[PDB]
Point group: C7
Chain length 288, copies 7
């Protein structure tokens, strides 16, 4: 049904530095294609078969079903049928779900790749940094970390990975958007094509008509889903490029009492789970 789709797609010492306020972007870019595919072939809208041939009155049920199946499997053979637009729109109308799944997988892969290998190292590094900071504060209440900060600043082995990971997703979004823009530009009449069953010995028989009629079914639904995906992706595109400006958008709090941008972001997002942080916030917020 539909209740089994929306309730599972969107209704369903560990730092949150992995997602970087980008988990929502991946979730909405990977679950939307799946949700649209599930609702397109649901038991409510996809009532009829995707293809329905118009066989003559002389034909029985079996011959008409054979014509239907043949014309369904003769879409790829250019020598069988003929259309003014060509076989590319028919190919797209036949293989839209598979390429939608391909785009879904292309979106899903890079975040999992980032989480699998590049997440544990920086996360353990940030636990180490926060533990050292807490120890320093406890000692002061009752300095070598700055050296680590400047050495990490001199490092260049992590920001490149982040920008590559968050540029691959933008490239995939651009490709999907331009593809859907091309797809929505179809004349919407290409589903009308003439199917001819005259292959092999069937040439001798004259009872079968030379050419048939065949219109694809459930084509407007594909167009509506495509335009919905197009508008969602064009709305979402600026978010990723806004994220890409990491160094252009905390650590300097205690005062007396380059890859550095990523570490700064991870440090400033982690203010919770430690009691001393909020106490210092209030103490040098009242003073300043």
């Amino acid at each position: 049904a539909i209740a089994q789709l929306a309730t599972e797609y969107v209704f369903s010492k560990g730092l949150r530095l992995e997602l970087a306020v980008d988990k929502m972007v991946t979730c909405i870019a990977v679950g939307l294609p799946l949700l649209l595919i599930s609702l397109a072939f649901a038991q409510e809208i996809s009532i009829g078969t995707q293809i329905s041939c118009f066989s003559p009155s002389s034909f029985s049920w079996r011959q008409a079903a054979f014509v239907d199946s043949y014309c369904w499997a003769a879409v790829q053979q250019k020598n069988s049928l003929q259309s003014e637009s060509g076989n590319l729109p028919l190919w797209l109308h036949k293989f839209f779900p598979y390429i939608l799944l391909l785009f879904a997988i292309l979106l899903y892969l890079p975040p999992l790749f980032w989480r699998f290998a590049a997440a544990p190292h920086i996360c353990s590094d940030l636990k180490f940094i926060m533990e050292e900071l807490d120890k320093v504060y406890n000692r002061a209440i009752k300095p070598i970390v700055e050296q680590y900060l400047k050495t990490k600043k001199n490092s260049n082995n992590l920001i490149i990975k982040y920008i590559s990971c968050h540029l691959l997703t933008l490239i995939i979004i651009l490709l999907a958007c331009i593809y859907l823009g091309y797809y929505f530009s179809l004349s919407s009449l290409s589903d009308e094509f003439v199917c001819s069953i005259k292959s092999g010995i069937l040439r001798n028989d004259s009872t079968v008509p030379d050419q048939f009629q065949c219109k694809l079914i459930a084509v407007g639904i594909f167009q509506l889903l495509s335009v919905i995906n197009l508008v969602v992706y064009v709305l979402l595109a600026p978010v990723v490029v806004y994220t890409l400006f990491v160094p252009f958008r905390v650590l300097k709090v205690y005062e007396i009492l380059n890859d550095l941008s990523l570490y700064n972001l991870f440090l400033e997002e982690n203010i919770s789970e430690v009691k001393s942080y909020k106490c210092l916030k209030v103490l040098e917020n009242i003073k300043s």
Copy 2:
């Protein structure tokens, strides 16, 4: 069935300050469309296909099924069929479930957005505040928090987010209500339309009649669900605007013994889980 819908839609150191007595509003505004969609296409009411063409007696099963499928997929093509009202009512009758799902998602998004990013900061802040208050009371039994309170009062970075989040939902409710008001105003006869299969080479044949008959099925159910949603939403609308008046509707309890409104609400809703609160309540309730 129906037992699998109602039992899962409504029958199915952590502060509750996230929901602010508004979790019920989101739940009833997001589960009702899903419940109605599930019951509309249940195995009890949606017995018949949404479309049933009346083919002549000469046609066999296959030709009639082809006519049915074509007219189902010819609703979008304005050049095929013709109706006095136009193709807009037919579009709505075809795509009602998808736009209902769209409204469901539009309701579901803002609460999750609020819970994902704006909830942890204020929640950790309130644990800090209550811990400081408990420490102050324990010290008194055996003052810097007021400075934090007035600094938070001078702040303006949280109330704006709350009012925007709870105004977006009101805007979406208004849009859904006006749309359903338009939809219920349909003449209920627009489902009667004339379908003609005369596209392409089928022009040569004269056996097929020029024009057919075609009435949509399961249309009154859509109207009843639409009016039910309309009445529910018009009843629910005042609740959100009542909530929006946060500063116009506790902290001053112990006595001797602007974003401030949100913090005041979160403080007054959190009186449980601490033993000293009820003891103070009784002590300066007997005295005052």
Copy 3:
């Protein structure tokens, strides 16, 4: 089947003061409609379609199916069919499951509303009261709570909510019972109605007969379920009004060694989980 319904509907420091020996009433008033709806449309009784038109012999399968679907969707249009009783009984026979679900939701809502907001405050209050009582008894073994009791007695902010919550349910039961009384009073012949397919250009054709026959199917099952619900609700009605008399139906146990009614009930129902209660019961039961 049926095994999946009965086994899940009825076979499937925390005080129990929320339910107040009324959880059973809500459970039997909310699960019975669901159980009846599930068994009505089970794979054992709902074998046949709800509607079966009698088309002439000339018509083929497709024309008869079209007549069936049209007459199913022409029940709401008063200008199509005609019956002596009117279109109200037909409306009821078509929309019985939906209104049953509506009554189920109307029963389910008030208990959840009471549990969501009015339960935690009084429950935390009763833990506070019992903890204070236990501390007082421990001190005596090795008095300010009475002041709290009399102040709560002077309060009037909780009994009104309880009586309103347990009067709304009675009102809904009365409405459901009177509706089912009206429904069972149907002549049981209203399912016989004459359906005419003469809308639009089909006027020109003379092959179609002017008027058809159409009897609804699975109508007696609805009547039996309605009368079962009626008898269950009329039997259940006195229970709620008996509950409503809260102040007219413990705390005075230890002796030397108005909203007050609700607190008294919650106190007397909570005698378990504390060891001193039973010891005092036996000590001043032997003496008195």
Copy 4:
């Protein structure tokens, strides 16, 4: 199938005093109707529809299906069909599953009622009694409970509830057994009845025959299930009346070293979970 029924019906500081060696009786009296209903409508035996009308050769598929549905829904109308036995056997053959479910619910209710309200009080009482006994024994190793025992003996507020609860079940068993005895006494030919479709304008037409034939299907299965339930219940009946004699069927163990019957039973069934009980058993078993 069948594997999903038997494996889930019978193969699937807390005292066990709630069940009193009667949990098996409730389980076998509540799961047997469900198991029989599930196996009756399984995908192995219930292959055919419950009703099969014999329409003439002139009728097509649709007219025969309409006759089938009408005669299925015309069983309740006494003016349509006619049988020598009457409409009561037909009513029973139509509504056997629903009344079986009704008997199942009538068996299920009283044990849950007993467990919900009358179980916690006596169970907490027995933990109190056993704790006091253990404390007394520990003190003796290194007497006020008898007063509690005699006061409970003078009480009369619990045995009445138990006997009423275990007499209601016997009454329901008697009613079910006598009903099944009546049902098995059917002539087994009442399923043969004459169905006439001559209601309304169909009177004018002469093509339809005046009277039809109609035999119910899957009727012997109902008779076999009914007789199986009858024999099971008549075998089970003496168990409940044997249980009812509670005072006529331990506490006097330690020696030097009326509702009383229920407490005595609960005490003697609880000898486990305490180490001193078995030690005393052996010590004054060797001596006596």
Copy 5:
């Protein structure tokens, strides 16, 4: 399918004295009927309906289906059909699955009865015995249990229950084996029977032939399952009678350093979970 059957039937301070190396016998005697029933009506072998009537050419689909259903429900009526063997083989061919389920339940009941009531008492007794033995050994490292052993030897209230429980199962196995021996002895031609639809007013009509043909389908599968069950049960029978000789097949280990048979078995099977047992085993194994 089949993967859902085998993986769930056989692939799917607490002493193990309950099973007494007999859990396997109960498991294989209760899961085999269920497995065979599930595989008999699987979606691979039970492709065809159990009954297929041969109606004449004049009959349409509906009349043939009515004949099929009638002859399916006319097997019990001896006056309708006639066969040389009689109606007993037809009864068996119709009700084989139900009696197989009955045998499955008859096997399942006695082990659960033994585990429910007779298991906890002896199990708690054996924990008491092993704890006393461990305490005695600890005291010796740094005698009243023998009195308990001889008193239990003088007792006769447990061995009788065990032998009755393990003789009831043998009786049920004997009954099932002799029944399957009778069933496999069928001539395998009894499924050929002549069905006549001439009941009631249908006597007047002459179009229907006087007598029909009707052969049951999926009958050889039942015979193969019956013979498989027969061979399994005849192979399994000696195991139970071998078990019954409990006193004829440990405690005398430490040395210086009648119901008694059951306690001896339970003691000797429980050598694990205690460290001193294996140490004593090696110490007086080296010496003796």
Copy 6:
């Protein structure tokens, strides 16, 4: 589908001495038949019914279906049909899945029998041995076990059970392999057989032809699965016989600082979970 088969068959103080690097052999010998059976009757390949009779043109749907069912159930009766090869190949083609399940159960039984009864004793023995060894090493850091080792060496009550258990599996593999070798040797034309419906009174009628045609369907799939199982089993056979040579393939590690083979294997496989083992390994690995 297929995703539900492969993901659940192969993708889905406790010593591992039970399996002895033979758990994989049992898993691949018990899950392969189940996987092959599941994929054979999947919703992708088993599209068509196993049997398809060629009835004449005069026959309608019902007579052809009756012929199909009869010939499906007339395979066992040798007097009905006739084939040059005989009824044995037809029996095998009909009952291949059941005998495959039988082989699966025959493989599954012996490992479970070994794990149920013979595993706990030796496993507890090995915990005792390793605990004694650890205690001896701790005492040495700050000898009676050798006596236990030689007494176990003199014992002969466990190796026989192991060799019998791992020879029964080899015997079953040999039987399955030779059976599949016979089955693959079928002429593959035995599925062509002549079916005659002339039993009983149908002899009088002359419309039915004397002999029919009937070819089994989904027979090549069975042959391919059989040859796959054959090659897998012939490849797997040497593994079991390699395992059987237990005494011909550790304990002598510490040095200064017959059933014995099984205990030696269990000891040498258990080097983990104890810290002293690896330390000794390195200490007398550097020295030797």
Copy 7:
């Protein structure tokens, strides 16, 4: 559907040294065939049967279905049909899913074999090594491990197993890629073949035509899935050979303060879960 495939295939003191940054390769090489097989036979694309025969007009439904089934099961018999390409392409088109599952199993086996037997030994070895290193560092703060390192360097019993395990997978990938390259090279017309039903006595009849037409359906989908698998595997191939160069791609960190490659990799990947590692990293990162 499709939502049940992608969400479960890719969306769904313990060291991670088992996977060695190769878990992703196994996951994508084992889940892709399963995902493609599931989507190929989904309820959206696999609408039509794989085979559709074109029977003449004289044939009824049953004869056409028999022809369909026969030609489906006559693909293997070379003497029945005839095609210019041969029976090999038809064999491949019939058995593509089974060989895809075979390749999936061939990929799945080696990683599980490596994890089952070769993982625990080296993993326990690495816990021992890291514990010894931590103890050495703690002693230094308040050397025999190097001897273990050089002895392991002299060992040659583990690198061979790793290279064999990661070369078997490469061999299987090469075989799958070359097979798919052959399969995609099919002329795509081989699905056109002539089927003749003239086996056995059917030779006498002349009504059946000598030769038929038969085109396979859902063949282009197989080609697209094959080419997708081909491109994925050819892209993935260099990853495995890059991994194979283990010795050519840490331990030397503390300084004053051959199978060796695998141990070095496992050591350098395990820097987390120990506090001293990061502290040493910063200390001799600032100095060097």
